[PDB]
Each structure stands twice: as C-alpha cells, then as structure tokens.
Scaffold this active site. Structure first.
Site, PDB file in Angstrom:
ATOM      1  N   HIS A  66      -3.829  -5.019   7.529  1.00 10.81           N
ATOM      2  CA  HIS A  66      -4.892  -5.004   6.563  1.00 10.81           C
ATOM      3  C   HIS A  66      -5.227  -3.585   6.207  1.00 10.81           C
ATOM      4  O   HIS A  66      -5.043  -2.684   7.020  1.00 10.81           O
ATOM      5  CB  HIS A  66      -6.130  -5.690   7.158  1.00 10.81           C
ATOM      6  CG  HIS A  66      -7.344  -5.712   6.286  1.00 10.81           C
ATOM      7  ND1 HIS A  66      -7.414  -6.278   5.030  1.00 10.81           N
ATOM      8  CD2 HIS A  66      -8.592  -5.249   6.554  1.00 10.81           C
ATOM      9  CE1 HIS A  66      -8.692  -6.120   4.604  1.00 10.81           C
ATOM     10  NE2 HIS A  66      -9.444  -5.503   5.495  1.00 10.81           N
TER      11      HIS A  66
ATOM     12  N   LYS B  59      -4.586  -5.332 -12.433  1.00  8.63           N
ATOM     13  CA  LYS B  59      -5.469  -5.374 -11.298  1.00  8.63           C
ATOM     14  C   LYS B  59      -5.972  -3.977 -11.146  1.00  8.63           C
ATOM     15  O   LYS B  59      -5.213  -3.024 -11.327  1.00  8.63           O
ATOM     16  CB  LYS B  59      -4.740  -5.778 -10.001  1.00  8.63           C
ATOM     17  CG  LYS B  59      -5.631  -5.947  -8.758  1.00  8.63           C
ATOM     18  CD  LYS B  59      -4.848  -6.293  -7.478  1.00  8.63           C
ATOM     19  CE  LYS B  59      -4.404  -5.074  -6.653  1.00  8.63           C
ATOM     20  NZ  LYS B  59      -3.426  -4.237  -7.381  1.00  8.63           N
TER      21      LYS B  59
ATOM     22  N   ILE C 245      -8.876   6.652   7.141  1.00  8.99           N
ATOM     23  CA  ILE C 245      -8.770   5.359   6.543  1.00  8.99           C
ATOM     24  C   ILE C 245      -9.199   4.396   7.595  1.00  8.99           C
ATOM     25  O   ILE C 245      -9.031   4.656   8.785  1.00  8.99           O
ATOM     26  CB  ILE C 245      -7.348   5.037   6.119  1.00  8.99           C
ATOM     27  CG1 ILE C 245      -6.336   5.496   7.191  1.00  8.99           C
ATOM     28  CG2 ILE C 245      -7.095   5.730   4.766  1.00  8.99           C
ATOM     29  CD1 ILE C 245      -4.897   5.058   6.944  1.00  8.99           C
TER      30      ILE C 245
ATOM     31  N   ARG D 290       0.053  12.578  -9.601  1.00 14.49           N
ATOM     32  CA  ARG D 290      -1.115  11.976  -9.032  1.00 14.49           C
ATOM     33  C   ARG D 290      -1.998  11.812 -10.219  1.00 14.49           C
ATOM     34  O   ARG D 290      -3.194  12.092 -10.178  1.00 14.49           O
ATOM     35  CB  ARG D 290      -1.813  12.855  -7.971  1.00 14.49           C
ATOM     36  CG  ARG D 290      -0.886  13.272  -6.817  1.00 14.49           C
ATOM     37  CD  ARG D 290      -1.600  13.962  -5.652  1.00 14.49           C
ATOM     38  NE  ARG D 290      -2.384  15.109  -6.195  1.00 14.49           N
ATOM     39  CZ  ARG D 290      -3.271  15.792  -5.412  1.00 14.49           C
ATOM     40  NH1 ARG D 290      -3.439  15.456  -4.100  1.00 14.49           N
ATOM     41  NH2 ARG D 290      -3.996  16.817  -5.949  1.00 14.49           N
TER      42      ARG D 290
ATOM     43  N   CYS E 144      -5.346   4.476  -7.277  1.00 20.12           N
ATOM     44  CA  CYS E 144      -5.183   4.157  -8.665  1.00 20.12           C
ATOM     45  C   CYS E 144      -6.271   3.183  -8.993  1.00 20.12           C
ATOM     46  O   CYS E 144      -6.251   2.045  -8.526  1.00 20.12           O
ATOM     47  CB  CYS E 144      -3.832   3.494  -8.963  1.00 20.12           C
ATOM     48  SG  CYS E 144      -2.404   4.512  -8.485  1.00 20.12           S
TER      49      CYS E 144
ATOM     50  N   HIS F 163       0.816  -1.177   0.000  1.00 20.29           N
ATOM     51  CA  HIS F 163       0.000   0.000   0.000  1.00 20.29           C
ATOM     52  C   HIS F 163       0.848   1.222   0.000  1.00 20.29           C
ATOM     53  O   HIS F 163       0.876   1.933  -1.001  1.00 20.29           O
ATOM     54  CB  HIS F 163      -0.956   0.060   1.196  1.00 20.29           C
ATOM     55  CG  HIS F 163      -2.205  -0.700   0.869  1.00 20.29           C
ATOM     56  ND1 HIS F 163      -3.340  -0.120   0.347  1.00 20.29           N
ATOM     57  CD2 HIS F 163      -2.387  -2.040   0.743  1.00 20.29           C
ATOM     58  CE1 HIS F 163      -4.140  -1.129  -0.076  1.00 20.29           C
ATOM     59  NE2 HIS F 163      -3.606  -2.314   0.149  1.00 20.29           N
TER      60      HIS F 163
END
Length: 125
Positions: free
Chosen positions: A115, A41, A104, A22, A82, A14
């Site tokens: 995670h 992905k 978050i 960006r 993304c 991550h």
C-alpha cells in the site's frame, strides 16, 4: 526464496526510477504509458529511489511501525506527485508535477510493501 510476484504490482503502479522530466509532459507521457489513469485520474504519486530501499521500508527498522500496522520510511524518497491540473476531461489533460522530497508512509501486507499512503504530510508542507 524468490518472492518477486507480489509487490511487482506495487512497483509498476507507483515506483518508477528516473524521472527524466519532472514537468507535465513527463506525467502526461506516463499517463499514456501506464494507462490506469483514464479518463485522467487526478493524483498519483510516483516514487523514485532505490528499489531495494522501497523493499526495506518493510523491514521494521528501516521503516519503523507507524500506527501499529503501517510503516513510515527512514529515508526521504523522492516523490513526484503528478497531480492533475487544468481541465479534466479529454486528453490533453496534463498534470501538475509537484515534487516533494520526503519520508513516505506506506503499509505492508504479507511483510512486503503493498500500500501507499498519499496522506502523509511533513510539518513543513
């Protein structure tokens, strides 16, 4: 104690730090670089922020317990999601970098943040 083995995996996957771009080709160069996103992905969040503050989402205070196991952070972290736009087959795939700047939800295993939930929405978006 030096417990810097476990969630290095998390911070490779991550966390980034310094999106210098960006854009789209930012995320496409990170598609090529990180290479866990083959054959393209789609969604993948990078977090940018202070690295020690990602670690300290697994405090208890600076990331309070959400739903008796999970954590929700204190600080609004930058997230550059993304999120693959356009044709999804072969490179050039490219990516729709949709930035948010928000709290978050992550989850801890061991007492270190392992995670990442991409599911957390703010009630603004």
């Amino acid at each position: 104690a030096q417990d810097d083995y476990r969630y290095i995996h998390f911070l490779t996957q991550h966390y980034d730090a310094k999106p210098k771009g960006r854009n789209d080709e930012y995320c496409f160069n990170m598609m090529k670089n990180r290479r866990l996103t083959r054959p393209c992905k789609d969604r993948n969040t990078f977090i940018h922020g202070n690295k020690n503050d990602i670690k300290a989402i697994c405090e208890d205070r600076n990331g309070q317990p959400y739903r008796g196991d999970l954590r929700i952070s204190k600080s609004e972290f930058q997230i550059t999601i993304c999120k693959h736009k356009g044709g999804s087959s072969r490179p050039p795939c490219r990516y729709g970098a949709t930035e948010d700047s928000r709290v978050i939800v992550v989850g801890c295993e061991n007492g270190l943040p392992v995670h990442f939930d991409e599911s957390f929405i703010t009630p603004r978006h």
